[PDB]
Amino acid sequence: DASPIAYVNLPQAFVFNVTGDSRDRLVQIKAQLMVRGAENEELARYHSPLIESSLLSTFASATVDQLRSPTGRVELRDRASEDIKAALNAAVGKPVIEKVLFTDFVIQ
Amino acid sequence: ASPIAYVNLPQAFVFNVTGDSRDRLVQIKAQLMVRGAENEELARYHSPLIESSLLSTFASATVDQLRSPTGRVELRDRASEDIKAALNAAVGKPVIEKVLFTDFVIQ
Amino acid sequence: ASPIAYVNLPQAFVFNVTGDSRDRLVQIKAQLMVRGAENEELARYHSPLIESSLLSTFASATVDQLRSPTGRVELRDRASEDIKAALNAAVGKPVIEKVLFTDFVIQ
Amino acid sequence: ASPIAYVNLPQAFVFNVTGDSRDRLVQIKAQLMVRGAENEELARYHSPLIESSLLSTFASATVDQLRSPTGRVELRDRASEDIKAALNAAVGKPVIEKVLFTDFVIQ
Amino acid sequence: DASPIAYVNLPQAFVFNVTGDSRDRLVQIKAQLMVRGAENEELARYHSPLIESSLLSTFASATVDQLRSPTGRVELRDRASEDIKAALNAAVGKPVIEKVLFTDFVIQ
Amino acid sequence: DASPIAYVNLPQAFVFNVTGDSRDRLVQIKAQLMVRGAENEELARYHSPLIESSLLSTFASATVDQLRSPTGRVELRDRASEDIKAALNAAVGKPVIEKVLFTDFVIQ
Amino acid sequence: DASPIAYVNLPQAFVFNVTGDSRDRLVQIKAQLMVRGAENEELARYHSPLIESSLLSTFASATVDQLRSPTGRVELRDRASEDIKAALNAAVGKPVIEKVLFTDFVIQ
Amino acid sequence: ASPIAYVNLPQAFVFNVTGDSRDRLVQIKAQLMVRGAENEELARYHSPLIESSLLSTFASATVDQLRSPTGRVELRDRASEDIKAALNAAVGKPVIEKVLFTDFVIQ
Amino acid sequence: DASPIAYVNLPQAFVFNVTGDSRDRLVQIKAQLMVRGAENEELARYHSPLIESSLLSTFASATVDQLRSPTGRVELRDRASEDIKAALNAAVGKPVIEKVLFTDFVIQ
Amino acid sequence: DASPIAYVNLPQAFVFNVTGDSRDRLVQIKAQLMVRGAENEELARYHSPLIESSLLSTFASATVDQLRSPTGRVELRDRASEDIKAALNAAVGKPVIEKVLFTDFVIQ
Amino acid sequence: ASPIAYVNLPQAFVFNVTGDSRDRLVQIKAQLMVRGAENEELARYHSPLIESSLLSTFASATVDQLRSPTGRVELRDRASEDIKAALNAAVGKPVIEKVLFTDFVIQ
Amino acid sequence: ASPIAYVNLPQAFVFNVTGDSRDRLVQIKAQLMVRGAENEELARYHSPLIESSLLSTFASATVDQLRSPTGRVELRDRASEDIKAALNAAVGKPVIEKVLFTDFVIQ
Amino acid sequence: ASPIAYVNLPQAFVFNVTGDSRDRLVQIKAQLMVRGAENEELARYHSPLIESSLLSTFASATVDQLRSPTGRVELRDRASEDIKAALNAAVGKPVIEKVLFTDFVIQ
Amino acid sequence: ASPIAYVNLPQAFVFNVTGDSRDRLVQIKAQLMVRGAENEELARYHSPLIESSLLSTFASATVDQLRSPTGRVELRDRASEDIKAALNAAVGKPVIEKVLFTDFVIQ
Amino acid sequence: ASPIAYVNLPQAFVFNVTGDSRDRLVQIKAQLMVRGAENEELARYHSPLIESSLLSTFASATVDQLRSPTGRVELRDRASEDIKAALNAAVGKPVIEKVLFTDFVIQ
Amino acid sequence: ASPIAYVNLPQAFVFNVTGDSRDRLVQIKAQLMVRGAENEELARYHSPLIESSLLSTFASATVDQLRSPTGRVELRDRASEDIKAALNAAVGKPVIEKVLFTDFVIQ
Amino acid sequence: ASPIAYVNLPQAFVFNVTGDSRDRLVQIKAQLMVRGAENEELARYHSPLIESSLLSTFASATVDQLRSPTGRVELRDRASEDIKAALNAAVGKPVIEKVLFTDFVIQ
Amino acid sequence: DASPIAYVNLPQAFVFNVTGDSRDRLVQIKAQLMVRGAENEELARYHSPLIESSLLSTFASATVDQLRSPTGRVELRDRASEDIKAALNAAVGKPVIEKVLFTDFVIQ
Amino acid sequence: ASPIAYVNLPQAFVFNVTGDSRDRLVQIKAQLMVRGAENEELARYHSPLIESSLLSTFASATVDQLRSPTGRVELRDRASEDIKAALNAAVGKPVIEKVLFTDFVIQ
């Protein structure tokens, strides 16, 4: 009965440009948020516009050398998850989420 | 430090880059982050004016402010201060706290 | 002063510029900024005249004016002063305060 | 005179130019600015005749009357008198006051 | 001519082809009927299938250079009106229409 | 003698391939029947399949020059009327229709 | 009585390829049945799947010579009718249709 | 001399048979002609077995047999005897009399 | 002695690539399960996701030459039906199906 | 006492890239979860976002010779299963699934 | 001779007849039997006149006439004559042949 | 002379007439019979005036007139002359020919 | 002989019968039994005439006949013979074989 | 001499008048009769004021006026002049020509 | 020994039986049990005749049989054997095996 | 401003008043007559407060006032002055000109 | 000088009060009048608590109060100050300014 | 500063009878819950079938004079709250709700 | 222990109990409170057996028990043990933990 895991769905997928090597490509990322506790579930859901901002800002600084690599995608989640906590810690004083989950990842 | 509230701007801003031979379009989906139930009421009512302040900021953005991480973050700080200055002249008070970009593509 | 109100012109304006290089289509979305319930009523009831006035204003602009930041700002001002000068000759009062552009593409 | 009224012609006037080196289509969307409660009634009833007078005006228009800013204004003036002359010869009254162009593109 | 004016709509536009220079075009004309009197308005609707045919037989005998000229267009509209009157006089003995109105005219 | 005119709709659009010379051009013909008399009206409706068959039989001999001259179209339209009669005249003993009308005629 | 005319509709058009052919040309025939009598109409409807089978056989055996000559169609409508009668004569012991009718015919 | 019944197979049989230089696609729409009421009840229940037997028969044919009308006749008889043999080993009864073809295209 | 035959449907159309991609082709298969007894019919429906999995595993080894020869197609049908039995033999302890039936087989 | 089999569907099909050798290739895997027990069935549904994230992190690290060889997917399913069990063990403390099934696999 | 055709009058005729104990509410549903396609056309278009002549006929019926078979055959054969005379004055043709009673309650 | 046309009055007439003891409730469904397309056009357009003349005539009729079929015909011709006299004063034309009763109950 | 066919008469029959202490409603739902494909064609087309010959027959039956089992059997044959005598006068053929009663209530 | 137009008042007027032995529920359905498009435009817009003037005139009449045929005629001429006097103080113009009664029940 | 199959009769049976004080209202919902695929085909096609033989049998039953449990078994068997006699004369075959009662109420 | 506007109150005003014999319902349908576009904006926005001032006024009405034509006029004039008093205390402006009663039934 | 806003409570308050002769069903529909966008937010969120304090006040009132125009005001003020007492204990703010009654009946 | 207030709606009204001195008067109560904290809002919604039971057991024990007296309803309100807290302390271990609210209360 | 779950029973239990003067209805709305994810599946799948065991317990209780607050508590505890006894005999598990009554009227 310790703080139960809950998943806040970010329904709108993230399309963005990768700063690629002379290749104009689009990356589509469908993500969700893993939280623990009820008041974190309603906080991450209520502040989802700010969370959608932290993710899109993180995905821009990601290189195609970092997206194509499996190890880079793992490091991408860590940096994307930490960037949300830094923004929420400054806005509401709480690190609401505990990690962000990628459920779809294509490079079109 | 009133509770935070987010005002949505539904129409995504579709505009073209600053003078490029390969004519590409920019699509930005934005929202407003306000503090206070009164500012939220003001941010919704004057949102047509806020949308114009965002376009005047986007249409004057350089290529660096569209393809660089530091450039995009500056454009966010650029667009926010433009809105505060525009609303400070219309209603006498800066309504928003900052602008939020939830989608940003160049195609 | 009377409270600020906005009148939305829902249909976007598509028009050809008098360009000399190639064929060009420009799409502009606009709303009206008025003050007072009296002018807000007139702005809606005379939207056909206002939609007509904006189209005649845009058609005279060249592409270089659309890319220069001052060209757009002086086009918005020229568009606003034309609607006022047109509604002054139809009802006797400059209904609107200024024209607001919320989206702008050259394609 | 009487308060102004606007009669909408929902038919979009699509026609082709006397193309210099290629075929090209023009799309015109027009309304009717009339003064009076009886003129508004007359303009809406005889809108087929009014729509016919506009097609005859557009089909006889040069390319200068279509792509020039001054000539496009001339096309509006000539189109108004064609309707006045038609309705005066049909009902005895020049029902409309002037024709308004809400959309004017050349694909 | 003393009766009030009425307008009978022909809702289906007229698609036909005319002999071009060497390639035939495809002309589309949206037309309406102008009548005077409730009796002529009554007949113009009931006999519209015959009126639709008399216009098609008129447009079939048209050429492109006749279409791209003010006189050739006015000649065509006036000829299309007399042909219907001749057709309806032969059927019901009354030229129920005053003239044919052209509301839209494209040629592609 | 002079019965009230009635128009019977043949809803099927006649698409057929004219024996083109330059290329294989299609033909789209939409027809309606002009009859006089209430008995002829329901006879034309009940025998519409037979009347449509008589229209395809006469269109099978149509050449390209047949469908492009206005004199040849009237020549064809008259052959369509007299053939529909002869078919119905030998099937039900009565020439049912008066004329056949063409309300849509394109070639492309 | 007089064995009144009756028409049984075959709603789906017949699409098949001409035999031979330089290429593999497609043709589309929309057919109906013209039966005589109230009992033959019931038989023609209930036995339509077999009647549709008898038409595919007759259709898929026609030459491009036969499908483009206007008299070749006549020799085909009669061949389609005689084949259905022979088929139904062995199925139910009665010739049912007395003829078949074409309402649309294209050679794409 | 039991009553004749027609069991319909809605989904048309789309398959491919290799020619000389073609990835040739064939479409066949078929129905089942049965005799008696018990077989009509059995032909509907055992349709997946019947549809499978038909697909197995068509795949074994060559484009030569699909061209010649005689070859198509011995394709119905080969499809019928295959269906009967398939139902004999499953329910001990040849359920159908003959399989009918209503559509046959090759493009 | 003979249990009643039942047919369990698999509405999923199996789409997969031919393994030999020197000739890059795509094949679509629609299958149905043939079982006996009401208990096996109940089992085949409940374990359909497992049965769908065994078919995909069988379709992975199918060679392009095996998909073309009809003797190889029945070699694949008699193999895919055995793999399903082996799969269900290990999961629930009894071979649920009798054979797999193919109702659509195209190589696009 | 026994734990009957239960299948937990994942309706979202997985779309990703291979890091292809010749060019960028698109893959589509449609998966389902095969659990045992009633508590695990509801655990598999509630933690679907975490499970879908683990399958994506597994499919991304897979190569082309894995996705084109039959046993390469056999190794992929095991790695897909073991990664989910390791993820859920750190999150909820139980290896919920015990295996993952593939019902559709296309590398286009 | 001029094949029989039936023209349906969907309006169920509702009218009152004066009895002795209480007022009687009669309800009649009728049709029209005509011969010839032209008389069938006239019977439909002149239905408001035919419905009028049936009400005038049924309103004069005594309660003893309704509760009597020979009285209803008298009323049935009388309403037909009253329609033939009504249409002879309007179009000069005895359109119908007879009137059919399909339902008859008196309650 | 001219073709007969029937203009239907969809809204039935409900009113009250005083008998001996109670106040009665009458329900009349009426249709107009005209000759000529001109009069059919006027009877439809001037229907509210026609619906007023019928109510002005019905409420002035007694129960002994509504009950007597010989006197009920007098009401039909009385209502017709009242409409003709009314329309002769509004448009100078006796538009209708006669009023028709298609349903008549006396509750 | 000829194939049996049943022609449904969906509009059920509702009529009164003269009792002693009350007028009782009678609701009969009937169908037609025909033999041959042509009689079925006539029974449907001449259905309004057939529905009339039943109302003339049903209304002439006393309560002592409707309650009796034998009374219903003779009424059925009487209603059947009445239709044949009616259709022999109209189209010279006795179309039906016998009338069937599928519902019989007396209230 | 302007063309006649009719303005419909949809919401019926339900009011009370007090007679002997009971109250009275009166229900009047009315339409306006105007001449000219300007009056037609004014009558529709000022209907809430017109509905009030009718209710103010209706609720002030005695039961002997609603029951008398001549009493209703003078009520129309009284209700009409009360509207003209009301609209003379509102917009300085008597808008209507007369009021019409299309349904008049009294319970 | 053919497989069992049930043919439904959806519309229940309503009929009257004579009791001591009143007429008792009986409602019977019934189905048919047949053996064989062909008999099931005839049972549905000859439902109007089977519905006739059932109502003809139910009318011959009294209250002391319906309220008696053993009196309903002989009724179920009488209704069954009476149907077989009706179909032995109609189609030369006894179609059903026996009739089934699923719902049964009185009064 | 000069132009008259009507603000509608769609809620029915149902309330009770104690009479000389029994409690009495009242149903009043009211609308607001304002002058000017700015007043129309306040009247719609402050309808909850205005609806309260009407109920607070109608609650104090006596049965002899609602039935007296002079009383309703005084009540109508008192309900308007009460509304102007409430809006003067809330927004500092007397928004409405008068209150209009379109439907009034006491019962 | 804060803007006024109205928070509606849709579910009308139905409660019972004990009278001299029987119980009386009182039905009150209320709205909330607040000043400030912040107080409008709390009034909506805490409406379940506000609907409770109103019933805790309404159900504790007498019939002599609800029939008194003065006591009805003292109730409206008692309910207004009772809500401030609860919200000053829940969130420490007098969220509302007063309560409004839009309908007040006693059944 | 304890926790933000939240309201959990019990949309099903409570209907029950009480034995009056003359009749069996019917009561109708529509209730809601006031909780503080996001977890208590989550628990009160999930355990609503238990909370609705603790109200019916409490309401059914109340007399008729206890309902008409406003001082008795405040006692019934504060009593129904403690009966829920004791029920949830034994069920889940937390006094989830803070107090019960009454939005509608009639007697018949 | 295992987590708590609630298995709803949508069938409201309607039955009768024998009172001293008449038979009083009883309406009990019940739900199942299970502990364990497996028990939830068993409780849902065995609802027909559970609904059977509840009615066997409800239809056996007396009126003095259903009206007793303490008598209802031991009814809830007895109906709970009745389900556990039945499910232990069928599946060898006491699936439920206790029954919950959500609504309980007797009327």
PDB file of N, CA and C in Angstrom, chain P residues 36-56:
ATOM      1  N   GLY P  36     -30.340  51.290 -26.147  1.00  0.00           N
ATOM      2  CA  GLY P  36     -28.905  51.403 -26.283  1.00  0.00           C
ATOM      3  C   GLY P  36     -28.225  50.044 -26.255  1.00  0.00           C
ATOM      4  N   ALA P  37     -27.080  49.960 -26.935  1.00  0.00           N
ATOM      5  CA  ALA P  37     -26.345  48.701 -26.991  1.00  0.00           C
ATOM      6  C   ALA P  37     -25.663  48.386 -25.667  1.00  0.00           C
ATOM      7  N   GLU P  38     -25.196  49.410 -24.947  1.00  0.00           N
ATOM      8  CA  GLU P  38     -24.514  49.167 -23.680  1.00  0.00           C
ATOM      9  C   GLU P  38     -25.490  48.708 -22.604  1.00  0.00           C
ATOM     10  N   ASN P  39     -26.701  49.273 -22.589  1.00  0.00           N
ATOM     11  CA  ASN P  39     -27.710  48.821 -21.636  1.00  0.00           C
ATOM     12  C   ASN P  39     -28.136  47.386 -21.922  1.00  0.00           C
ATOM     13  N   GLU P  40     -28.288  47.032 -23.201  1.00  0.00           N
ATOM     14  CA  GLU P  40     -28.639  45.659 -23.548  1.00  0.00           C
ATOM     15  C   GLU P  40     -27.591  44.673 -23.051  1.00  0.00           C
ATOM     16  N   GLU P  41     -26.321  45.083 -23.025  1.00  0.00           N
ATOM     17  CA  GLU P  41     -25.270  44.208 -22.516  1.00  0.00           C
ATOM     18  C   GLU P  41     -25.395  44.012 -21.009  1.00  0.00           C
ATOM     19  N   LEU P  42     -25.716  45.081 -20.274  1.00  0.00           N
ATOM     20  CA  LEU P  42     -25.889  44.958 -18.829  1.00  0.00           C
ATOM     21  C   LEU P  42     -27.156  44.185 -18.486  1.00  0.00           C
ATOM     22  N   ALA P  43     -28.223  44.377 -19.265  1.00  0.00           N
ATOM     23  CA  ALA P  43     -29.483  43.696 -18.980  1.00  0.00           C
ATOM     24  C   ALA P  43     -29.337  42.184 -19.102  1.00  0.00           C
ATOM     25  N   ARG P  44     -28.635  41.719 -20.138  1.00  0.00           N
ATOM     26  CA  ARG P  44     -28.419  40.284 -20.294  1.00  0.00           C
ATOM     27  C   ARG P  44     -27.475  39.748 -19.226  1.00  0.00           C
ATOM     28  N   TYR P  45     -26.400  40.483 -18.931  1.00  0.00           N
ATOM     29  CA  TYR P  45     -25.416  40.003 -17.967  1.00  0.00           C
ATOM     30  C   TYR P  45     -25.989  39.958 -16.556  1.00  0.00           C
ATOM     31  N   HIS P  46     -26.803  40.949 -16.189  1.00  0.00           N
ATOM     32  CA  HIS P  46     -27.370  41.041 -14.849  1.00  0.00           C
ATOM     33  C   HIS P  46     -28.797  40.507 -14.782  1.00  0.00           C
ATOM     34  N   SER P  47     -29.144  39.571 -15.664  1.00  0.00           N
ATOM     35  CA  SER P  47     -30.458  38.938 -15.589  1.00  0.00           C
ATOM     36  C   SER P  47     -30.714  38.224 -14.264  1.00  0.00           C
ATOM     37  N   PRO P  48     -29.756  37.508 -13.655  1.00  0.00           N
ATOM     38  CA  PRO P  48     -30.039  36.917 -12.334  1.00  0.00           C
ATOM     39  C   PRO P  48     -30.469  37.938 -11.294  1.00  0.00           C
ATOM     40  N   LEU P  49     -29.790  39.085 -11.221  1.00  0.00           N
ATOM     41  CA  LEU P  49     -30.209  40.128 -10.291  1.00  0.00           C
ATOM     42  C   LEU P  49     -31.549  40.725 -10.703  1.00  0.00           C
ATOM     43  N   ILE P  50     -31.777  40.871 -12.009  1.00  0.00           N
ATOM     44  CA  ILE P  50     -33.033  41.440 -12.486  1.00  0.00           C
ATOM     45  C   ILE P  50     -34.188  40.477 -12.239  1.00  0.00           C
ATOM     46  N   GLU P  51     -33.965  39.178 -12.465  1.00  0.00           N
ATOM     47  CA  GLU P  51     -34.997  38.192 -12.163  1.00  0.00           C
ATOM     48  C   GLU P  51     -35.343  38.179 -10.680  1.00  0.00           C
ATOM     49  N   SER P  52     -34.382  38.521  -9.818  1.00  0.00           N
ATOM     50  CA  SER P  52     -34.659  38.584  -8.387  1.00  0.00           C
ATOM     51  C   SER P  52     -35.529  39.788  -8.045  1.00  0.00           C
ATOM     52  N   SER P  53     -35.260  40.936  -8.673  1.00  0.00           N
ATOM     53  CA  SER P  53     -36.058  42.129  -8.408  1.00  0.00           C
ATOM     54  C   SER P  53     -37.498  41.960  -8.872  1.00  0.00           C
ATOM     55  N   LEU P  54     -37.732  41.115  -9.877  1.00  0.00           N
ATOM     56  CA  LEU P  54     -39.093  40.871 -10.337  1.00  0.00           C
ATOM     57  C   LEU P  54     -39.858  39.981  -9.366  1.00  0.00           C
ATOM     58  N   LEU P  55     -39.225  38.909  -8.885  1.00  0.00           N
ATOM     59  CA  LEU P  55     -39.884  38.036  -7.918  1.00  0.00           C
ATOM     60  C   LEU P  55     -40.129  38.759  -6.599  1.00  0.00           C
ATOM     61  N   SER P  56     -39.182  39.600  -6.174  1.00  0.00           N
ATOM     62  CA  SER P  56     -39.378  40.388  -4.964  1.00  0.00           C
ATOM     63  C   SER P  56     -40.512  41.391  -5.114  1.00  0.00           C
TER      64      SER P  56
END
